[PDB]
Enzyme design. Sequence first.
Site, short mmCIF file in Angstrom:
data_model
loop_
_atom_site.label_atom_id
_atom_site.label_comp_id
_atom_site.label_asym_id
_atom_site.label_seq_id
_atom_site.Cartn_x
_atom_site.Cartn_y
_atom_site.Cartn_z
N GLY A 1 0.82 -1.20 0.00
CA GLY A 1 0.00 0.00 0.00
C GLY A 1 0.85 1.24 0.00
CD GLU B 1 7.81 10.60 18.17
OE1 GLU B 1 7.82 9.81 19.16
OE2 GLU B 1 6.76 11.01 17.62
CB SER C 1 12.34 4.13 11.99
OG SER C 1 11.96 5.48 11.75
CE1 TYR D 1 5.62 3.28 16.36
CE2 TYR D 1 7.87 4.02 16.06
CZ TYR D 1 6.68 4.08 16.73
OH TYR D 1 6.55 4.96 17.78
O1 LIG Z 1 3.52 8.21 9.73
C1 LIG Z 1 2.48 7.71 10.10
C2 LIG Z 1 2.31 7.41 11.55
C3 LIG Z 1 3.26 6.57 12.14
C4 LIG Z 1 3.28 6.35 13.51
C5 LIG Z 1 4.26 5.36 14.10
C6 LIG Z 1 5.64 5.42 13.49
N1 LIG Z 1 5.90 4.53 12.59
N2 LIG Z 1 7.17 4.56 12.00
C7 LIG Z 1 8.16 5.41 12.26
O2 LIG Z 1 9.20 5.39 11.59
C8 LIG Z 1 7.90 6.40 13.30
C9 LIG Z 1 8.88 7.31 13.70
C10 LIG Z 1 8.60 8.24 14.68
C11 LIG Z 1 7.35 8.28 15.27
C12 LIG Z 1 6.37 7.38 14.89
C13 LIG Z 1 6.64 6.43 13.91
C14 LIG Z 1 2.34 6.99 14.30
C15 LIG Z 1 1.37 7.80 13.74
C16 LIG Z 1 1.36 7.98 12.39
F1 LIG Z 1 0.38 8.72 11.85
N3 LIG Z 1 1.48 7.40 9.24
C17 LIG Z 1 0.17 6.81 9.53
C18 LIG Z 1 -0.01 5.53 8.74
N4 LIG Z 1 0.22 5.78 7.31
C19 LIG Z 1 -0.63 5.60 6.28
O3 LIG Z 1 -0.28 5.81 5.13
C20 LIG Z 1 -2.03 5.12 6.60
C21 LIG Z 1 -3.02 5.11 5.46
C22 LIG Z 1 -3.13 6.15 6.51
C23 LIG Z 1 1.55 6.34 7.06
C24 LIG Z 1 1.69 7.64 7.81
#
Ligand SMILES: O=C(c1cc(Cc2n[nH]c(=O)c3ccccc23)ccc1F)N1CCN(C(=O)C2CC2)CC1
Length: 243
Positions: A104, A221, A137, A140
Site C-alpha cells: 500500500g 520525531e 523507526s 514499527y
Molecule cells: O507516519 C504515520 C504514523 C506513524 C506512527 C508510528 C511510526 N511509525 N514509523 C516510524 O518510523 C515512526 C517514527 C517516529 C514516530 C512514529 C513512527 C504513528 C502515527 C502515524 F500517523 N502514518 C500513519 C499511517 N500511514 C498511512 O499511510 C495510513 C493510510 C493512513 C503512514 C503515515
Amino acid sequence: SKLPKPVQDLIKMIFGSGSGSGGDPIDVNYEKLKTDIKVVDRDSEEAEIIRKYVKNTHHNAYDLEVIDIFKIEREGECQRYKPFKQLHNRRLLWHGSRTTNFAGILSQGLRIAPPEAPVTGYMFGKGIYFADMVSKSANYCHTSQGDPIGLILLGEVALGNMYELKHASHISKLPKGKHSVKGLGKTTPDPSANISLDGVDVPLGTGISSGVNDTSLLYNEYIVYDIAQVNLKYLLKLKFNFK
Ligand SMILES: O=C(c1cc(Cc2n[nH]c(=O)c3ccccc23)ccc1F)N1CCN(C(=O)C2CC2)CC1
C-alpha cells in the site's frame, strides 16, 4: 521475470502466497507498485552512507544488519514534491512500518490518516511521522524472532520551519509559517558528523545527549501534514538479530 533476484525476493515478501495467493506472477505484482525499484550496489558510496546511517543511529533489544538497499522512485512523487523541493531544512529520515503495509505504501505512498479517526495513537496529530535514528523507526516493523527481517524507508522530508515540542499536542494544525513538528528527544545524532547529500541533510552522527531537559521522548520525531513534503528515496531490507 527479468527482474533482479533481490527485487523478486522483495516482491514475494510484501505480497505473500496462500488463499488468493496461489496466483499473480512477480512482474504483475511489481507493476502494481507503480514504483521503479533498483538495487543499490553494495560497493557504492550511496550504500556506504546508508550503512553508516544505520550503524551509528542505533543499547539493547536487537542488532540491525543491512541485507539489501533499494532505490525507489514512486510514480509522480518527485513531480509532486516540486512545490517543497527548494524549501530550506530537507532531511533524509527513517520510516519503519510492518511489511504487510508496504504494498500500500509503495503504490499509494505514505498518507495522512482520515480526519474522522480518533486522535489517540497520534501523539502529534494526523501526519506522516519520521525519525532521525533507525532504532526508533525499526520498532514499527513489529518484526519477530520467528521472521526477523524488516523493511524501513528513507525519505527526503521537506521540514521547513519546524515547530518544536517536548510533549504531545494531538493536533494537526500548526501556527503560521511552520511547516512541520519536531518532537524533541533526549538523544540526537551528533550534528558535527551530519553531512549533506544533494542539499539534503543526512544526520548520521552517532547518538549523543541533546541537552533537552523536560521531555517525554527518548528520540526525536518529525511530523509533516502534507504528503507533498515527502519524497521516498530508499527502502532497506534489514536483518534483526535478537537475543
Ligand atoms: O507516519 C504515520 C504514523 C506513524 C506512527 C508510528 C511510526 N511509525 N514509523 C516510524 O518510523 C515512526 C517514527 C517516529 C514516530 C512514529 C513512527 C504513528 C502515527 C502515524 F500517523 N502514518 C500513519 C499511517 N500511514 C498511512 O499511510 C495510513 C493510510 C493512513 C503512514 C503515515
